[PDB]
Amino acid sequence: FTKAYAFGFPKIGEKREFKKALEDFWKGKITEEQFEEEMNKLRMYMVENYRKNVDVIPSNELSYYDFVLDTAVMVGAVPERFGEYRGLSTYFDMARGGKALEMTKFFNTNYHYLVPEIETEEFYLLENKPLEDYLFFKSKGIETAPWVIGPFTFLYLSKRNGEWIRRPNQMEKLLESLVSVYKEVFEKLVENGCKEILVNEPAFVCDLEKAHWDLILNVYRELSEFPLTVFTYYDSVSDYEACVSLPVKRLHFDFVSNEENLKNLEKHGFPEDKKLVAGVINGRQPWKVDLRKVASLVEKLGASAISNSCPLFHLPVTLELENNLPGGLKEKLAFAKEKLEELKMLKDFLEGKTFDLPNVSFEDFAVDLQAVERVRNLPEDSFRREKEYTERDRIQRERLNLPLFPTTTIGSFPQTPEVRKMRSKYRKGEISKEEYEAFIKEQIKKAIELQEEIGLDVLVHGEFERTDMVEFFAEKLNGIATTQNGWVLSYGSRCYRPPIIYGTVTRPEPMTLKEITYAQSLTEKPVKGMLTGPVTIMSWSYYREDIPEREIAYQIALAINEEVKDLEEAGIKIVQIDEPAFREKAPIKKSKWPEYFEWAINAFNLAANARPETQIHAHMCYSDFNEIIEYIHQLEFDVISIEASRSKGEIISAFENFKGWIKQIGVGVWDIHSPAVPSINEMREIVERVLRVLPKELIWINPDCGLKTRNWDEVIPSLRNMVALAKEMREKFE
Ligand SMILES: OC[C@@H](O)[C@@H](O)CO
Numbered sequence: 001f002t003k004a005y006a007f008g009f010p011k012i013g014e015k016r017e018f019k020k021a022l023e024d025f026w027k028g029k030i031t032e033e034q035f036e037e038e039m040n041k042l043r044m045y046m047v048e049n050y051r052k053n054v055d056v057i058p059s060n061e062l063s064y065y066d067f068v069l070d071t072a073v074m075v076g077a078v079p080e081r082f083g084e085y086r087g088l089s090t091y092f093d094m095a096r097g098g099k100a101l102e103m104t105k106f107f108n109t110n111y112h113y114l115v116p117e118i119e120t121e122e123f124y125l126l127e128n129k130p131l132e133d134y135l136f137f138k139s140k141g142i143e144t145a146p147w148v149i150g151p152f153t154f155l156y157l158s159k160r161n162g163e164w165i166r167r168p169n170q171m172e173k174l175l176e177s178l179v180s181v182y183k184e185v186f187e188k189l190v191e192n193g194c195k196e197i198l199v200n201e202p203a204f205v206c207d208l209e210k211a212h213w214d215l216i217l218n219v220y221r222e223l224s225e226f227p228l229t230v231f232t233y234y235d236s237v238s239d240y241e242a243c244v245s246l247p248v249k250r251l252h253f254d255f256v257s258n259e260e261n262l263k264n265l266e267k268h269g270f271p272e273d274k275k276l277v278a279g280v281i282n283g284r285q286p287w288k289v290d291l292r293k294v295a296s297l298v299e300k301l302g303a304s305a306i307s308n309s310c311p312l313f314h315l316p317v318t319l320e321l322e323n324n325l326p327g328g329l330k331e332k333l334a335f336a337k338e339k340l341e342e343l344k345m346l347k348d349f350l351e352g353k354t355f356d357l358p359n360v361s362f363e364d365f366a367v368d369l370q371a372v373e374r375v376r377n378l379p380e381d382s383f384r385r386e387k388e389y390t391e392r393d394r395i396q397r398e399r400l401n402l403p404l405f406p407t408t409t410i411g412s413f414p415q416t417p418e419v420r421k422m423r424s425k426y427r428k429g430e431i432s433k434e435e436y437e438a439f440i441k442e443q444i445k446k447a448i449e450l451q452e453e454i455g456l457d458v459l460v461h462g463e464f465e466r467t468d469m470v471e472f473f474a475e476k477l478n479g480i481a482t483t484q485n486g487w488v489l490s491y492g493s494r495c496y497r498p499p500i501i502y503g504t505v506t507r508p509e510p511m512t513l514k515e516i517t518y519a520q521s522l523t524e525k526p527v528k529g530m531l532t533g534p535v536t537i538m539s540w541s542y543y544r545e546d547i548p549e550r551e552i553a554y555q556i557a558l559a560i561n562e563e564v565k566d567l568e569e570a571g572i573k574i575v576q577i578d579e580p581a582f583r584e585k586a587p588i589k590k591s592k593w594p595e596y597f598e599w600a601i602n603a604f605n606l607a608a609n610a611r612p613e614t615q616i617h618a619h620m621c622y623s624d625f626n627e628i629i630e631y632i633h634q635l636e637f638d639v640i641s642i643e644a645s646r647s648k649g650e651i652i653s654a655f656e657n658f659k660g661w662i663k664q665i666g667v668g669v670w671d672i673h674s675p676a677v678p679s680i681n682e683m684r685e686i687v688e689r690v691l692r693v694l695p696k697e698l699i700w701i702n703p704d705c706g707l708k709t710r711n712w713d714e715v716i717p718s719l720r721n722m723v724a725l726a727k728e729m730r731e732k733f734e
Contacts, residue, residue, distance in 0.1 A: 001351060002298075002304070002305065002306060002346075002347045002350040002351050003055050003056065003277075003304060003305040003306075004053070004054040004055050004056070004305065004306050004307065004343050004344070004346075004347040005054060005055070005056045005198075005229075005252070005277055005305060005306070005307030005308075006050055006053065006054040006056075006058070006307055006308055006312065006339075006340055006343055007058050007061070007147055007198060007231070007307065007308065007311060007312070008061070008283060008308070008310070008311025008312040008313045008314075009046055009049055009050060009058075009061070009312050009313070009336055009340065010312065010313050010315070010316070010317045010336050010488075010489065011042060011046065011061060011062050011063065011313070011489070012317065012487060012489050012495060013042050013045060013317070014045075014317050014318055014485075016487060016495065017038060017041065017042060018039075018042060018489075018493070019493045019495060021035055021038040021039065021042075022035075022064070022065075022492065022493040023493050026092070026493075032088055035088075039062060039064070040136075042062055043062050043133075043136070043137075044140070046061065046062065047059070047137065047142055047144065049337060049340055050340065051142075052340075052344070053340040053341055053343055053344040054307075054340065054343055054344065054347070055347075056145050056196060056198075057137075057142060057143065057144045057145065058144060058145055058146075058147040058198055059130075059133040059134055059136075059137050059144030059145065059146050059147065060129060060130045060133045060134070060146040060147045060148060061147050062133075064088070064091065064092075065091065065092065065095040065096075065114070065492055066095065066113050066114045066491070066492075067113070067149060068106075068113040068114055068115075068116065068149060068154070068157055069091070069094060069095060069101065069113070069114040069116070070129060071116070071148065071149045071154050072114075072116035072154075072158070073085065073091065073094075073126055073127055073129075074125070074126060074127055074128065074129055074130070074181070074185070075123040075124070075125070075126065075154075075178060075181045075182075076120075076123055076124040076125070076126040076181075077116045077117070077118055077119075077120075077123065077158075078090070078094065078126070079094075079101075079117050079119055080119060081099050082094060082099065085126060085127075094114065095114060095492065096492060100114070101114040101115050101116065101117060102114070102115040102117075102159075103115070103491060105584065106157075107202060107234050107588050108234060108584075108585070108586070108587065108588050109234070109284075109314055110314070110488070110490055110496070110498075110539075110540065111313065111314065111489060111490065111491065112490060112491035113157065113491075115157065115158060115159055116154070116157070116158040116159070117158070117159055117160075118155075118158055118159070118160040118165060118174065119160075121173060121174060121177065122177050123174075123177045123178045123180070123181045124181060125181050125184050125185065128185055128188060130146040130148055130185055130189060130197075131146075131185065131188050131189055131192065133146065134146055134189055134192065134194055135192065138192070138193065143193075143195065145194070145195070145196040145197060145198050145229070146189060146194065146197050146198065147198045147200065148182075148185075148197065148198070148199055148200065149199075149200050150199045150200055150201035150203075150230065151175060151178045151179050151182050151219055152171075152175075152201055152203055152204070152212075152215070152216050152219060153200060153201045153202055153203035153204075154178070155171050155174060155175065155178065156171075156203035156206070157203070160174075168209065168211040168212055168214070168215050171212075171215060172215060175215060175218075175219055179219055179222050179223065182223060183222065183223060183226075186223065186226040186228075187226075190226060190227070194227070195227055196227050196228075196229055196250075197226060197227055197228050197229065198229055198231060199228050199229065199230045199231065199248075200230075200231050201230055201231065201232055202231075202232060202233055202234055204216070204232045204237045204238060204243060205232055205233070205234055205235040205236060205237055205238060205254075205588055205589070206238065206588055206589065207238060207589050207590055207591045208238040208239065210239065210242070212238075213238075213239050213242035213243075216242070216246065217242065217245070217246060217247075220246045220247050220248060221247050224247040224248070227249070228248050228249070228250070229248070229249070229250035229251070229252065229277065230246065230248050230250070230251050230252065231252040231277075231279070232252065232253060232254060233252075233254035233257070233279060233283075233309055233310035233311070234254065234257055234310055234588055235254070235257055235258050235260075235587065235588050235589055236253075236254070236257075236258040236259075236260035236261040236264070237253065237261065238589075240260075240261070240264035240265070240268060241268055244268075244270060244271050244274070245271070248274065249273075249274055249275065250274065250275045250276075250277055250305070251274055251275070251276060251277065252276075252277035252278075252279055252307060253265070253276070253277075253278065253279055254279045254309040254310055255278055255279055255280050255297065255309060256279060256280065256281070256282045256284075256309035256310070257282075257284065257309060257310065262297075265301070270301075275304050275305065276301060276302075276303045276304065276305070277303070277304075277305040277306070277307055278297070278298050278301055278303040278305065278306050278307070279306075279307050279308060279309035279310070280294045280297060280298060280306055280307075280308075280309060280346075281294070281306075281307070281308045281309060281339050281342055281343055281346070282308070282309050282310070282339075282545075283308045283309055283310040283311050283312045283313075283314055283315060283339065284309075284310055284314050284315075285315075285542055285543070285545055286315055286316075286319075286333050286334055286335055286500065286542050287332060287333065287334065287542075287544075287545060288331075288332055288333065288334045288338075288342070288358075288360050289334075289342070289360060290357075290359070290360040290361065291342060291345055291346050291349065291357040291358070291360075292349075292357045294346060295346060295349055295350060295357065298346070298350060299350075306343060306346055306347065306350070307343065308339055308343065312336045312339055312340070313336075313488070313489060314488065315335050315336045315339065315488065316335045316336065316483065316485070316486035316487055316488055316497070316498075317335060317336050317337060317487070318335050318336065318337040318338070319333050319334060319335040319337070319338055319486075320337070321484065321485060322483050322484060322485070322486065324484060325481050325483070325500075326366075326481050326502070328365060328366075329366075329481055329500070329502050332360075332362050332365065332502075333500070335486065345357060345358075363546055365502070365503060366479060366502050366503025366504065367503055367504050368478075368479070368503065368504035368506060369504075371504045371505075371506045371555065371558075372504055372551075372555075374558065375551065375554045375555050375558055376551075378554065378606075382558075382561075382606055382609055383602050383605050383606055383609065384605065384609075384636065385605075385608075385609055385610065385612065385636050386611065386612050387612040389636075389638065389662065389663060390662070391612065392612045392613075392638060393638065393664075395612050395613050396573075396612075396613060396614075396615045396638060399573060399613055400526060400573060400574075400615065402457055402458070403457065403730060404696060404697065404729075404730050404733065404734075405687075405696070405699055405700070405701055405726045405729050405730055405733075406457040406458060406700050406701070406726075407455075407456050407457045407458070407700070407701045407702065407722060407723055407726045408456060408457055408458035408459070408460070408528070408666070408700060408701075408702050409451075409456065409459075409460050409702055409703055409707065409719070410460075410576065410617075410619050410641045410666065410668075410702050410703065410705065410706070411460075411463070411578075411619075411703075411705055411706025411707055411708065412462065412463040412464075412466065412706045412707060412708035413447055413460070413462040413463070413464065413707055413708065413715070414707060414708060414709075414710055414711055414712050414715055415464060415708060416712075419443060419464050422436060422439045423436075423465070423467065436465075437514070440464055440465045440515065441518060443462060443464040444461050444462055444464065444515060444518060444519050444522075445522055447460075447461065447462040447464070447519075448461070448519055448522045448523055448527075449522075450716070451525075451719075452523060452525070454716070454719050454720055454723055455720075455723045456525070456719070456723065457525065458525065458526050458527075458528060458574060459519070459523060459525050459526070459527045459528065460519075460527065460528050460530065461515050461516060461518075461519035461527060461528075461530070463530060463708075465515060468496065469532045469536075469578065470499065470532060470536065470537050470540040470541065471497070471499060472532075473511060473531075473532055473537060474499035474537065474541060475499075476507070476508075476509075476511040477505055477506070477507055477508075477511075477537075477556070477559055478503075478504075478505065478506045478507070478508055479501060479502065479503040479504045479505035479506060479555070480499050480500065480501045480502070480505060480541065481499065481500045481502055482497065482499050482500070483497050483499075483500065485497075486498065486500075496540070498540055498541050498542050499537075499540070499541040499542075500541060500542045500543075501538060501541050501542065501543035501544065501552060501556075502544065503544070504555060505552065505555040505556050505559055506555070506559055507559035507560075507562050507563060510563065510566045511563050512529065512530065512531065512563065512567070513563075513566055513567065513570055516528075516529050516530070516567060516570070516572055517570045517571075517572070520570075520571065520572060526573045526574050527572070527574075528572075528574045528575065528576050528617070529563075529564070529567040529572045529574065529575035529576065530575075530576050530578075531560055531563060531564070531575065531576065531577050531578070531607075532560075532577070532578050532579075533560070533577050533578060533579030533580075533581065533582070533603070533604055533607060534553045534554075534556040534557035534560055534579075534603040534604065534606070534607050535553055535579060535581040535582060535585050535600050535603055535604065536578065536579050536580055536581035536582075536585075537556050538552055538553060538556060538581075538585075539581035539584060539585040540581070549599070550599035550602070550603070553599060553600070553602075553603040554599075554602070554603055554606055556603070556607075557602075557603045557604070557606035557607040558606060558607075560577070560607040561606060561607050561608075561609055561610075564577075564607065564608070564609075564610050564614075565610075568610060568611055568614050572614075573613075573614065573615060574614070574615045574616075574617060575608075575610060575614060575615070575616055575617070576616075576617040576618075576619055577604070577607060577608055577616065577617070577618060577619070577637075578619045578620075579604055579618060579619070579620060580619075580620055580621065580622075581600075582600055582604065582620060582628075582631075582632075582635075583620070583622055583628050585600065586600070590627070593631075597628075597631040597634075600631075601631060601634045601635060604618070604635050604636075605634075605635065605636045608635070608636055608637060609636075615638045615639060616636065616637045616638045616639070617637060617638070617639045617640070617641060617666065618635055618637035618639070618640045618641075619640070619641045619666075620640070620641075620642065621642075621643045621668075621704065621705040622642070622643070623643070623646065623647075623651070624647075624651055624654065625642070625651070625654040625655070626653070626654045629654045629655070629658050630658075633658060633661070637663070638663065638664060639663065639664040639665070639666055639700060640663060640664070640665055640666065641665070641666030641667075641668065641700070641702055642665065642666065642667065642668060643668040643671075643704035643705055644667045644668045644669060644686050644689075644690065644704070645668055645669055645670055645671040645678070645686060645704050646671060646704075648685055648686055648689060649667070649685070649686040649687070649688075649689025649690045650689065652665075652667075652689060652690045652692075652694070655694065656692065656693035656694055661694070662698070663698065664697075664698045664699070664700060665690070665694070665698055665699060665700065666700040666701075666702045667686060667687060667690050667699055667700065667701060667702070668702055668703055668704035668705065669682075669683035669686045669687060669701060669702075669703070669704075669722065669725070670683065670703045670704055670718055670722065671704050672703050672704050672705050672706065672707055672709065672710055673704075673709070675710065675711070675714050676714075677714060677717045677718045677721065678718055678721060678722075679721065680721050680724055680725045680728070683701075683721065683722060683725045684725055684728070684729070687699065687701065687725070687729055691733070696733050701722060701725065701726045701729075702722075703718070703719075703722070
């Protein structure tokens, strides 16, 4: 007998019933009772999928917005600004709106959770959702195992007075209080017949201190009387011996995202007093795997149970209807539903109920050797630009002829309903390619003339022809496919369809030349080429695992550099490369950052390997650069734009303290997440702060980030104020 587990199955539904329910309810289209009924249908669909494939059925997974927020509500962590917790009304206020909790990435994934704000030192059982869901399924004659976020990870993902609660001394006191509530929840479950509880502790894979583990041991000793099964994923646990010594009867390890868990288990063994649950089916990638190979790992480990490595919600629901993928790709893929079926196959095989498993091997599939070696024989010169910054700077400035404190923007422009409809009609084939392009040309012209009128120094074409930055390029690159319904939850009701890098990546034709060249033909002002970095493209896409990550990254980077070269040839003087994944794609373990940044840096530089006369702008809307400034410094950009409104310019500290910093900085002086129009005085405070140490010639003035989420009536007046401010600064520091 091989007990099979599974967790994190997508909640959105095959027809995206979840997204529609949430949105209809918010718009007032349906009632709370109707919203609930729809959610229960999804609940049944989920456990139905589980029941057909695995032995242990999870419950408490259908979150109405975020499971971390659900955990906070469970323990009473509701900020005072929300008043008494009413229910859904309060829940969504904490989730979205002007008073909502901060939203941030869940570990190193594309799912975003809500950051609990701990205002009190005493937790209490506000709502027992785990019990609620457990009883709901029991009433349907279905035994389930509540899926909950463990107490250590919960605090680890939370903040107290604006700071993370991550040091042992910051966690210790709160934990005793927190575990007491968990104890109450667990006791009630057991009293009601609950046989197993799935506790998620992914924080165990962070670079923890031995002091953290001392705290964790004490936490679980207090919960040793409950039927707990602890899961860890996204990487190897930070202290194997300490982890396996925890007083829990069942322990799960992710044997997919890392090799350390296995090596450590082979070297130190695994306790006889507890059972191992082998996470052997990947939840982060959509590739079919040779179940005979997986089977051998499980057999060597003598593991009594199996399951996916990490939550399945990082994958789309089903591959079933994906019948328009490039030839041969569909047969090598497997989404959430198929991953569950793989666990069933593995279970049956391991129990001798079957003696055969489908063969899986496609190493040569979609592999373009000529392009591969083009990257494998990479000579240093493709990673370092011809001349050093100081020399390039001299050449660029004489070429650009820009004033002190030049102004520009750094992203998309707002998209009217008309722009959206045209893109729609185009995708549906309602209109021709020539027709769509003509429309785009019109929007670009209007945008260019508007910037001219407003008085900006460096212009952008608006990107009215793009929706998702990564999808835009994925559709133009060979080796990358896009799905029709491969939806994956990002947060709340927001879903995205990750592209699939299934083979060697190359750029067959120019991807952005027509729009950029056209925009530039309308003005004497320099117009920016706008591209997305290599690491960002793969960060938002699924990709082959039988090739090192850095190779895929360099392949993409080379393709991007070809675009850069075509832009240069076309006379484009400035090229911006947005690489938000530079930090966002970094390992959860900062101890693994050296190896990661080595190639992330090389990938960007390969993509940005432009002629000395070509000004390269790197763009990243990070809230702080203190922990990565040393890596940033190795990127061969000429200008780097940052968001400085939130910190009122204090984010500049990482730059003024970097000895030898001499590159230009595009200072964001306007928060594009607010409809409010920044006053000239507000922006002035920011620029003045930035000018405290750094020389004035390094500074550019621009908005914080893209503008596509704002309306024109907000953008125009803010842009004019930005120009007015820059003009003022020039007179002052003339
Ligand atoms: O160390 C992991 C931390 O930086 C966050 O990604 C957790 O969500």
